[PDB]
Amino acid sequence: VGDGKYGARDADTKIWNGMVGELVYGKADIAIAPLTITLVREEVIDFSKPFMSL
Amino acid sequence: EQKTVVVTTILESPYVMMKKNHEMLEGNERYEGYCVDLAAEIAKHCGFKYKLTIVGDGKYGARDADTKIWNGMVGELVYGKADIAIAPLTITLVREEVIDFSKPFMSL
Amino acid sequence: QRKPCDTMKVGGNLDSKGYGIATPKGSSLGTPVNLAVLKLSEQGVLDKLKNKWW
């Protein structure tokens, strides 16, 4: 990932930074990372059933 | 029109239990428990009415060996007897073959 | 949690699995039910009810 951030929705500019942004804007086809399931991320990407709990 | 959705479940403490006044109560009021509160919350968020129903054979079960006839809580949904299931139903590969599951709400 | 407490657990867990809300395949209830489950897990209502009933 170009800038080393897991990333989230920005400061109400509604641009996405980091890996989520790289997915939403079509920079890569699939993420394989410790990306935590959250209700805002489910808005724009699909998650499998979890592989680990923490 | 709002359908009263056919909820299916199974009695088990403390998930779903007959309230000790069940001889003197009617409707969903006979049922209380963790899964009944969860069903109430889910319906209140989705905004529909619901009617509780109980599994026929009392089993979670699977598809029968060498026949693959579904039964139990899975069978009721596979044959379309009910709309939604809210029960201590463990997520498994065979059950994911035929029915969809939410994200997991509890771990064990 | 309940009397007579004549019996006790031993050892650690052999595995880990999850429960979930289940729906007939592809029905229009599935996705709003999933979003409701996510929101309730983010609000912590499931934990309050867990304390309530255990």
Next chain:
Amino acid sequence: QRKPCDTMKVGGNLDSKGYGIATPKGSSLGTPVNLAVLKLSEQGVLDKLKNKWW
């Protein structure tokens, strides 16, 4: 769990969440990836992998 082992953990988990493989909402692989992750979880390959690196 690995050298220098000089910190100390305090407290338990305050919540529970999980990770998942995630993809743009633009591709069919969301089902076979789910089936793959379930197969790996049931075959115990996650336990072999967890007991390889922790």
